[PDB]
Amino acid sequence: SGFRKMAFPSGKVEGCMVQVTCGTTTLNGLWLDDVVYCPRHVICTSEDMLNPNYEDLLIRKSNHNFLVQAGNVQLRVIGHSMQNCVLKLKVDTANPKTPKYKFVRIQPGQTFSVLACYNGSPSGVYQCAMRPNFTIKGSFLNGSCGSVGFNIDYDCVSFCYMHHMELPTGVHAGTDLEGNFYGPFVDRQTAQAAGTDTTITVNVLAWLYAAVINGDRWFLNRFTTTLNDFNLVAMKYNYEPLTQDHVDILGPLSAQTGIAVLDMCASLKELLQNGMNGRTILGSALLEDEFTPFDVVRQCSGVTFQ
């Protein structure tokens, strides 16, 4: 028992991280087979970070303008192209550490692990969710761009995120591995801002089930609610709506604990109207919304990866 913010083991991804230098900018790249992926703003100059023309900027580069370091071994670039907001650097060596992988794009509400890197060297791993407003509440400093987010399914790494920028509230924006931004953000230094977020309702319910599995029951009650009546309360507390599909996804957790989903909704309803009154759930004094129903089952049931 116990419940922790759990990331995937990072070893398969660590063996893909490299350092990409263009001019005086150094950031991280992801080396899979004979291609290195990195944020295209690596080619941006200090003179015009405000409104670059990346097509123009890239046509002025040669292969030799990209220094790629895999550890203490330099990789020769033999081709380059732009795909949306990422650069694809063709190199003359396939990464022998290439895992089985996919490029997948995730939905707001889903979670992933981030391997933060500087100078091609992994610094730390942590778990994030895609917020409803398409930001992620990350932990990133200068030089972290090109760090990736990922999920693991048995032996296969599903890459879902590459880091590109930090917004003025301290949250982060980036792309999928095809270079397409999550949300309405661009890789220029404009006045963009996150815009209003909501709480991921289905995930809070998942985490309440985790608490019950782990012996926190104090927030349970004998009441129930209709889905419609629950959602009227959710709207007022800036929670997002719960759907019948969310109820279906919570089925296994409902069956394990014996607590009907709509009964748990009635408990969440009372938590929202009354607060927690000096008590905690799973060591938190807030309702936690960055665990999916999958995350809870995995952690409380013990799935591994190989």
Ligand X SMILES: *[C@H](N)[C@H](C[C@@H]1CCNC1=O)NC(=O)[C@@H]1CC2(CCCCC2)CN1C(=O)[C@@H](NC(=O)C(F)(F)F)C(C)(C)C
Asked about 41 being catalytic, the answer comes back as yes
CB under 8 Å to 219, separation ≥6 — which residues? 208, 211, 267, 270, 271, 276, 279, 281
- Site for its own copies contains 25 (CB under 8 A): no
- In the shown chain, the binding pattern of residues 181 to 200 toward ligand X, with x for contact by CB under 6 A and - for none, equals ------xxxx-x--------
- Site for ligand X contains 143 (CB under 6 A): yes
Q: What is the CA angle 154-155-156, rounded to 5?
A: 100
Block residue for tokens 């919570």: 250
Candidates 39-47, 49-57, 235-243, 292-300: pick the segment binding its own copies (CB under 8 A). Answer: 292-300
- Site for its own copies contains 110 (CB under 8 A): no
42-71: contacts with ligand X (CB under 6 A):
44, 49
Block residue for tokens 């992933």: 112
Considering only CA atoms, which of 8, 3, 5, 6 is closest in space to residue 115? Answer: 8
- Site for its own copies contains 14 (CB under 8 A): yes
Select from 20, 171, 204, 211 the one that contacts its own copies (CB under 8 A): 171
- Tell me how many residues contact ligand X (CB under 6 A): 20
- Site for its own copies contains 303 (CB under 8 A): yes
Taking only Cα atoms into account, the Rg of the chain, rounded to an integer number of angstroms, comes to 22
From 41, 80, 164, 172, active-site residue: 41
Listing DSSP states for 96-119 in one string gives TTPPEEEE--PPTT-EEEEEEEET
Q: Which residues bind ligand X (CB under 6 A)?
A: 27, 41, 44, 49, 140-145, 165-168, 172, 187-190, 192
